[PDB]
Structure 1
Amino acid sequence: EAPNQALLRILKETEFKKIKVLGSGAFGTVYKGLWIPEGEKVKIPVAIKEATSPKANKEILDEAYVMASVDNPHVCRLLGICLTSTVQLIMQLMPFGCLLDYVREHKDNIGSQYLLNWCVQIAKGMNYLEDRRLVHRDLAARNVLVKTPQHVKITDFGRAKLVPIKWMALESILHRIYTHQSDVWSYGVTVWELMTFGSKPYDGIPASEISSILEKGERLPQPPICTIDVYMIMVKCWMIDADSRPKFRELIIEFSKMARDPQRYLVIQGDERMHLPSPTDSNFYEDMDDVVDADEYLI
């Protein structure tokens, strides 16, 4: 098939500054930082993902490969890699963190317009991955990052090709089959995570029971804010027949029609009177002088 002519940018350690730590786990640690290229007079807000074991490097270099091979407004691109002893991925700073925590922390100000717009954006990013013949294998609200409350992007290409049980299609749990239609099942679950304001799917149920639960005909419940219109979409993503499930191009269309009249499809008390931070807010955005967002920094 088509040659992957993507450019892998190697960045010097001296070209960027680590400001603070954002979060640490088993993988390593993600830092908040600034990238100041050559003599460009720009400061790009960045996220730097950083023991050295040859196996862990192959995994991070596999994620770098996939992340450098994407370009879409609703997908996180790799800005570059820094080849130190540790080896670190330089990514775009998504100031508002993951969507999962965002919905939990801001339920009182999240309205129908935002929720439906987020669904359209995830469908667009996912449909792009399908175009690039990329199967995510780990879509969830934790892997959708917030640039601004009005702009979200899909991330975490650590599992992407060409285990998270409660987000998986039945063919995936039973046979390890992953298609773009299995990403649709995970898309259904992600929507459920948003519509419930960050609830844990199948809370209290052990992952081993999930396979048998789905086989019986049981699915995630109808969230209180969901009309039968929105829930019907969730249910269709959870059909046994993968070809029966909607295609992402149909999900973009479905959620877009709904996003034109949000109150008809989602019932939230206090809707329209709610508000989230916007680039039209007082002090929404050290030396703020020459900072440009990665999306406007092109070479």
Structure 2
Amino acid sequence: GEAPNQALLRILKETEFKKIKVLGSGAFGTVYKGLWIPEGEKVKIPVAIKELREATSPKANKEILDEAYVMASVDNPHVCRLLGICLTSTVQLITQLMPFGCLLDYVREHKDNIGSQYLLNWCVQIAKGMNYLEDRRLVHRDLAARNVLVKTPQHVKITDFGLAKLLGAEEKEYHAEGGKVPIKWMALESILHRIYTHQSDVWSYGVTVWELMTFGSKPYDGIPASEISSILEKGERLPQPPICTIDVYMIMVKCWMIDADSRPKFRELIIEFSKMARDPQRYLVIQGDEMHLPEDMDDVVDADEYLIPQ
């Protein structure tokens, strides 16, 4: 680590957010939905506001500000940008709204309508997204279908930097605290040595692709977490999904290889899936493919078009 992080954290007035309406509740916290209307600008930006439960127990305010710190330090089409924070009672994360939600829910709730062109394209976009984070020396640690949001069915972005970690020109690993990370998405060296690395994200990427190819299945739906370690140890891996050619499945397996360095690089995955996406019917055999996917507001601009220096 060495280059200075000259990102801008923007504090936003609680009086700039109209039309609030709870999106997802949940144990962890609460995501809202609203309209951010910059102070003296004829623009209304559709936003999600995240206020994670734990009342004010400063323990929270940490996680939420680390989230913010990272989310504010990323500029990529395939990664969610932090719009700003709000210093109300508790802190709030304000970010571009992703109208179609989680990619996980999105595939779950659209199976009989998702073409191969999309699935392969998303894998491209998530690989692009990750490669970016690789460049910004940044280990996501929690890549899952549930952390990819959908802007439009042809444009996804990665999110949830709750466990993300910056590295160093020195550093190559991240020796975690007391683990609180999903087992079914984490590399084998993550589950035994609490080691995290870019190549560990690769594994999670593999599992993510596995989720999409299976339209939302739960990795190891049977097996309980206290057992995951043992299974992978013996050699077992996720099955090959129905719609999946060997070409595509073998990419998934390559991500789950015991020697981390033998795993593909995200820049290879971009290339590989990118090739594949030029002829999607040849790598994915989806029954029915060849599929279509879908007060006043003059002043609405997507965040993606709301810029300002930097």
Q: What TM-score bracket applies, with the shorter chain setting the length?
A: over 0.9
Q: Aligned-pair distance for 1:123?
A: 0.1
Q: Which runs of 5+ in 1 are unaligned?
A: 279-286
Cα deviation, 1:185-218, whole Å, max 9, x if unaligned, reads 0000000000000000001101111111001111
Give percent identity, aligned residues only: 99
Please say if residues 137 and 178 of structure 1, whose CA atoms lie closer than 8 Å, have aligned partners that are also in contact: yes
Q: Which runs of 5+ in 2 are unaligned?
A: 168-181
- Tell me which of 278, 284, 306 is aligned to 1:297: 306
Q: Give me the TM-score of the superposition, normalised by structure 2.
A: 0.92
SS in 1 for 2:206: helix
SS of the aligned residue for 2:22 comes to: strand
Deviations along 1:83-108, one digit per CA (max 9) or x if unpaired, are: 11122110110000000000010001
CA deviation vs aligned residue, 1:46-78 (integer Å, no higher than 9, x gap): 000091111110110111000000000000010
The correspondence for 1:114, drawn from 109, 112, 118, is: 118
* Aligned length, in residue pairs: 290
Aligned counterpart, 2:43: 42
**Conserved 8 A contact 1:18-1:31:** no
Name the counterpart of 2:172.
none
CA distance in 1, matches of 2:19, 2:300: 15
> Which aligned segments of 4 or more residues in structure 1 are displaced greater than 6 angstroms?
none
CA shift, 1:27, in A, is 2.7
Q: Secondary structure at the match of 1:127?
A: helix
Q: Distance in 1 between matches of 2:27 and 2:4?
A: 34
Per-residue CA distance 1:87-136 (angstroms, 9 max, x = gap): 21101100000000000100011010000000000000000000000000
- Secondary structure at the aligned position of 1:89 is classed as strand
Whether the aligned pair in 2 keeps the contact of 1:32 and 1:93 (CA below 8 Å) is yes
2: distance between equivalents of 1:225 and 1:27? Answer: 34
Measured on the aligned residues, the alpha-carbon RMSD in Å equals 2.0
Distance 1:6 1:53 in 2: 27
Secondary structure (helix, strand or coil) at the match of 1:222 reads: coil
Displacement after TM superposition at 1:18 (Å): 4.3
Q: For residue 29 of structure 1, what is the aligned residue in structure 2?
A: 30
DSSP 3-state at the match of 1:47: strand
1:181 maps onto 2:199 in alignment: yes
How far apart, in 2, do the equivalents of 1:169 and 1:52 lie? 33
Deviations 1:111-168 (A, max 9, x none): 1000000000000000000000000000000000000000000000000002900000
Q: Is the 8 A contact 1:140 1:190 kept in 2?
A: yes
The whole-number CA distance in structure 2 between the counterparts of 1:30 and 1:18 is: 14
Question: 1:268 is paired with a residue of what secondary structure?
Answer: coil
- 1:26 Cα offset (Å): 2.2
- Whether 1:156 aligns to 2:165 is no
Alignment correspondent of 1:10: 11
Can you list the C-alpha shifts for 1:165-193, whole angstroms capped at 9, x where unaligned? Answer: 00000000000000000000000000000
